[PDB]
């Protein structure tokens, strides 16, 4: 049912910027439809799901413990840290950090987790080794959100991200325990309500992670489907627009409205 793709076009007309989009069948891995699937866009907070997939992989292999407690200091605190700023005195376990990173988009939690794995170079190495030779993280929070025109640092492609997320959520890459934890963290996302969630009909399942950056950057990755069961992966990114936050949210929500109506 083809009409999501026109709305995408509209979104480029209203937003006056690039929009990348792909829809992939969760079980087969087959692409159902796409628009600029292979241009680079800043990941923004979207990368935090990939970060925690790397952490669960380390857990799976006896390299890390979800219950391990990390102690940090005021010097570590960065812009947008609602959970880590609260637990400054007692610290946070690895599990609590991924929870805050994914459900609350906590920037300090993401930095702390990055240091456990060896920093941005090592996340990129993780992604390379599982077959994603496009996605790359270069900087820490909050710089990774700059979205400088033509800057390929901290970027991914819609197609690369969709495929990577499928592999993390459905492969044998992670154990069934780790897959349930990663999906549940995404399902519990508390900060993407104005996006795809706003067009989601009653009874539908969704696990997602949104992102926002400078230069009108805004995006989302998600596994969703009817009958409370996920059956497709959806990735949408946009960068460069001058429209307001609410205008950018609306366009993504409307693309979601269209792919849902034409399921």
């Amino acid at each position: 049912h083809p009409e999501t793709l026109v709305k995408v076009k509209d979104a480029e007309d209203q937003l006056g910027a690039r929009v990348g989009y792909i829809e992939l069948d969760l079980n087969s891995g087959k692409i159902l439809e796409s628009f600029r699937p292979e241009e680079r866009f800043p990941m923004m907070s979207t990368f935090k799901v990939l970060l925690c997939g790397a952490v669960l992989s380390r857990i799976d292999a006896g390299q890390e413990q979800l219950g391990r407690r990390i102690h940090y200091s005021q010097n570590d605190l960065v812009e947008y840290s609602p959970v880590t700023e609260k637990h400054l005195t007692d610290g946070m376990t690895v599990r609590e950090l991924c929870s805050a990173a994914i459900t609350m988009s906590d920037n300090t939690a993401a930095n702390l987790l990055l240091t456990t794995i060896g920093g941005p170079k090592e996340l990129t190495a993780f992604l390379h080794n599982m077959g994603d030779h496009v996605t790359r993280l270069d900087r820490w929070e909050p710089e990774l959100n700059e979205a400088i025109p033509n800057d390929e640092r901290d970027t991914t492609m819609p197609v690369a991200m969709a495929t990577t997320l499928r592999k993390l959520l459905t492969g044998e890459l992670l154990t069934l325990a780790s897959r349930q934890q990663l999906i549940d963290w995404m399902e519990a996302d508390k900060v993407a309500g104005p996006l795809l969630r706003s067009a989601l009909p009653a009874g539908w399942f969704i696990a997602d992670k949104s992102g926002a950056g400078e230069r009108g950057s805004r995006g989302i990755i998600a596994a969703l489907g009817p009958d409370g069961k996920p059956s497709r992966i959806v990735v949408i990114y946009t960068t460069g627009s001058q429209a307001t936050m609410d205008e950018r949210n609306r366009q993504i929500a409307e693309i979601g409205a269209s792919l849902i109506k034409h399921w």
């Binding site: 005021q74 010097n75 605190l77 840290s81 609260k86 459900t103 959100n145 104005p194």
Partner: protein, 165 residues
């Protein structure tokens, strides 16, 4: 109606009960438990990665505990930001709050965090400030020139900056 704001943040005072905090902030904006333990976390408008917000800590998990902790991002605006990287360089560990403010500008900073571990005494009081240059502050987006200044007993223990010119 209304979301959490800088004004409501100002009105909430140390010593207040849980019910007072909720009455002033607007219960529909607040939550407790989960990631926040026994603290009360109240949401402002949507902003960048999250929302502008406040978080209020209490002396204990008791229903009758008192506010000993106030924290916020993007509710409070600096009244006259005059910070620059040069001034940030002059800030030194061991300076008093009074000396820091004289160096970075009396209106460049907002209170990110203020905690009294020995409430109502000020002994061991920890104070964290967010400071901005001319157009550095953003209540709905990403800072474009900011610093984090941390104090204990009114004495500077640490400083850090991002994107200052």
């Amino acid at each position: 109606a209304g979301v959490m704001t800088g004004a409501k943040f100002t009105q909430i005072q140390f010593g207040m009960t849980r019910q007072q905090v909720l009455d002033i902030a607007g219960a529909e904006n607040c939550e407790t438990g989960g990631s926040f333990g026994d603290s009360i976390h109240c949401r402002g408008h949507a902003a960048g990665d999250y929302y502008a917000y406040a978080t209020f800590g209490f002396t204990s998990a008791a229903a009758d505990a008192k506010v000993d902790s106030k924290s916020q991002e993007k509710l409070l605006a600096p009244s006259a930001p005059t910070l620059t990287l040069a001034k940030f360089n002059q800030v030194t560990v061991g300076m008093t709050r009074a000396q820091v403010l004289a160096t970075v500008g009396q209106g460049s900073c907002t209170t990110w965090s203020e905690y009294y571990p020995a409430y109502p005494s000020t002994a061991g009081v920890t104070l964290s400030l967010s400071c901005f240059d001319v157009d550095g502050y953003s209540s709905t987006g990403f800072y474009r020139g900011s610093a984090h200044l941390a104090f204990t007993d009114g004495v500077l223990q640490g400083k850090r900056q991002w994107d200052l010119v």
